[PDB]
Amino acid sequence: SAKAISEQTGKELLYKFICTTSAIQNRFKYARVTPDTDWARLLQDHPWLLSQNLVVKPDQLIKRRGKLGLVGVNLTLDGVKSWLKPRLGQEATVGKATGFLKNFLIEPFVPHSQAEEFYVCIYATREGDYVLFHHEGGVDVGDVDAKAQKLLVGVDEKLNPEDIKKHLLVHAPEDKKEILASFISGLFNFYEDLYFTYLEINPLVVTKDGVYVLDLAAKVDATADYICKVKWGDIEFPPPFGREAYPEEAYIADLDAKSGASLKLTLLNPKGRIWTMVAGGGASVVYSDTICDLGGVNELANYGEYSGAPSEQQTYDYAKTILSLMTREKHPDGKILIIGGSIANFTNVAATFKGIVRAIRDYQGPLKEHEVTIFVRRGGPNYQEGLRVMGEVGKTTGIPIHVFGTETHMTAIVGMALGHRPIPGKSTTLFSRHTKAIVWGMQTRAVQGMLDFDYVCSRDEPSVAAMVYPFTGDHKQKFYWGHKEILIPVFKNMADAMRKHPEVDVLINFASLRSAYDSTMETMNYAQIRTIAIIAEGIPEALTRKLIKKADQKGVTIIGPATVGGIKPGCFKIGNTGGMLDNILASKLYRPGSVAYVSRSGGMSNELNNIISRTTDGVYEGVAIGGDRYPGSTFMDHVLRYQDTPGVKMIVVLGEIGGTEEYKICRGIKEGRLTKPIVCWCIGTCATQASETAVAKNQALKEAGVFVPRSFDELGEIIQSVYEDLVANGVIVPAQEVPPPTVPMDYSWARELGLIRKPASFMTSICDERGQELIYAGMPITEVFKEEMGIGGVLGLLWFQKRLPKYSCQFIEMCLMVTADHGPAVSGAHNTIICARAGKDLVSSLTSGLLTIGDRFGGALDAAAKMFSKAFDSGIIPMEFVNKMKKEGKLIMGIGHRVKSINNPDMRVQILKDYVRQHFPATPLLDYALEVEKITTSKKPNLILNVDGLIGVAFVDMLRNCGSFTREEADEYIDIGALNGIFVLGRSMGFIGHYLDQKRLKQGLYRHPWDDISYVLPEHM
Amino acid sequence: SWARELGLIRKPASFMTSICDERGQELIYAGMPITEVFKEEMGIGGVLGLLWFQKRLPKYSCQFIEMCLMVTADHGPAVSGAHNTIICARAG
């Protein structure tokens, strides 16, 4: 899409990026005045208004400003102020469009003669670039394309200055011929390496002083933004001059601008009764065409669309806006809502219809105030159930909703909404049954659709031989052939894919817009690839022109960019064309017919498949050439391809407004090149160049011998009429329909629409990862960091699924801080160091040390809590518990230190103990353990509470003594093993620290000397 | 299970496993049943040839694999992994 630029921005980059020796004068000398400014700031920051005289212009892309009286010529500064006083911010009409004027540009006026103002322009065409010069300047040139000097510089060639000094300036004064030529050459260096499309200087004010631009007109290719973001910068694309945008149009523009889908809405008149909400671009163009040709010219309220599969919230907002905009006032004949569309490819109809019923059932009252009637037509994946949903919403809410499927014509519902009808060398055989493909990209859904198409077409071998994905190694992907599973090799380089597969004669290029050019250029130097399909939407037009010229040099057939692909029923299908198998089997695309078709956009090829299925014996072949401006194959490269093939008996072409391509089809009829019956229609008349309108194309096609209907509603009728007349002389022999080999459907599709039930494993009452936020136990991660809970809080959430109080989380953190490292001598730290010195990695070292936390090392946490809990809940005093554990062996776990005894406390038992005494209500098991401590410190001086015993008993007090745990949760967490987890998670910090320490000291492999071992082996076994 | 027993739903499978079919009436190794494993008189080197390489190795190569497993057995308790196993076993 090459669209216009503001002229301030045009001369901005023109002064910024020209490269020629001719002096462009008045550089960086422009001003912009708005109704949203005062004058003094740009008065003092632009001192050069204080020196020269001025010329002012409206900066809103206004066509022909001279004869309409909008330019102020040769006026001084305060004179410009009094000239701009009744003009800046007031209404004006140009052409047939009105509006306010909010932008004006001031430029230093130059005194000159009208005899040496000149005209130059460079515009883009398909076969190259046209550079046109004319010596008669000014706006009074008139007819420019018959008298001016034109030169077409080809694609992939550089301008010679000798050709422009020979051919272009032939009617120019020679005193200025050596200057401007270099300037024009420099401007071509501005035209090409800034990715322009259309650029006029009219007039080019060149004097003896130098060169000057006064007026510019440029359409630039925005899709090359990824090439020019470092060179354009903050570039704005203005709208055309028309009426002021409504705030709801601005809201739909904002919702399109934040989202990835395509949302469009433009009102024709706000008090119309025919409101349309169509899914599809060419579909909505055809619906608005059929409305404006069936008498609904005046009260067609809007045209807009929702496509690219929008979300539920996005289509709810779109349907909310379009339902509110027809609520404001009432119309005595009643209002009509047309929710139409063509056959969708992969979109579930029920999701978008769930958005629509969320808008409708919330707006049921105000919609049945204004006497509305809703007509719905749909098709695609799961359309019948969505039609049933919106019909039952119409039946409960009382609003009349007439749902329709693929058995109706597409635009019949606006014929019966308005009451006009009742309410009920290049090859010629591209694809074959032995065609093998190579797919560029990770597109397993498209490859699986191609294999499913091959299975339902009774084919022997898959269409896809390999895939090419450069971001991973050579492996195999698992795909389905009916019921059986096959493997398709995924290669990394394309040369590896071509060496293993010499029978591949088509490549499907699913690359992005910025990497399809390099992939296609690297593809075209392989001689086995005879045809390429480019899928990407938005390849800039110079790059696809280079692709066209190398394809024409090499002789390969590019199915053009921005296409869905092409489908030849019975043999081959490109990627995702057709859609799911519901659309392939519903439109009978598994057996060959005798009708070919060519479309431009892809969204209408589904409806053409449906029309040729329901009126004719079927499609033989069908190719969408693409929505780009310069497709890799036009209409003619495929109509010559169909005219030479003997299998097809009639051709159908659906064109678009714009471009004189169908007149070549007329010319091919009048010379006798095309003999087979042609049925054309150029969609989108809607006139509410003059040879590029669809009514002129339809008129010149209807006169040349092409069966052209009166509207789109009669297209299936005229195809059926030509078909029955072409059977009537006996050249089409319809074969009797064989049933296709059926497939099992899918698991994901049958569970997405919810008709299969599977029992699940892994019940996980922890950490919902699905959704928009990571939820912990029941609390989102933003609430985790907002409620200011630390690592003790998230251990409370992950381990216990409970929001612990703020002292218990800090106690958990304190326990993780004291159960960290305890030196390298101990058993697990030793194993981690022996592992780290063997050079392993962090996980194996930590893991080899962690797998010693058992009963003897690290198991006093859980045992010293089970023992004291089984003693305290049995109901014996401590002086009997010590003697009970004295008559059985088995020392009290959690009692005793080897050094820190009494009058010498352990000082990490003490920090914990004064935490549990202060911030911690009702601690009976710690009091019991301290009474056992009082009894045992009388026996020995070094029998104190361990840290491994005090954390155990204080953690049982933490569980059963605060809130949140009853007593069977609190004992289950003490039985399952949530106290081993405290030691393991604490000691993992020390073990990772030991690993990093032995990696930082760079120690070698450990060997453990033989005089510490004392081998005690048997004599001779 | 009922829709896949009568075969009207299709699910792509993971875990492609070119080794050890446990389903059926016999345990099949690489391609060879367990009764053929013990009937052809292949030892532990034969079943390493079947499980690891999916190939029926010749009778000297299986015996060489067994010989390598016999010499790459223990090399005393001083070495690093034997040390870690003993520190782990003494921690009970």
Ligand SMILES: CC(C)(COP(=O)(O)OP(=O)(O)OC[C@H]1O[C@@H](n2cnc3c(N)ncnc32)[C@H](O)[C@@H]1OP(=O)(O)O)[C@@H](O)C(=O)NCCC(=O)NCCS
């Ligand atoms: C299908 C389609 C969207 C292709 O998808 P795509 O955008 O190419 O998806 P990809 O995964 O290939 O693109 C990923 C991009 O992000 C980049 N990327 C991906 N992962 C990345 C990572 N981890 N780090 C950095 N960059 C990464 C890649 O570089 C790639 O862009 P580049 O290769 O051009 O640089 C497009 O071809 C299409 O729309 N086709 C159909 C056209 C249509 O609908 N028209 C029919 C009617 S006209």
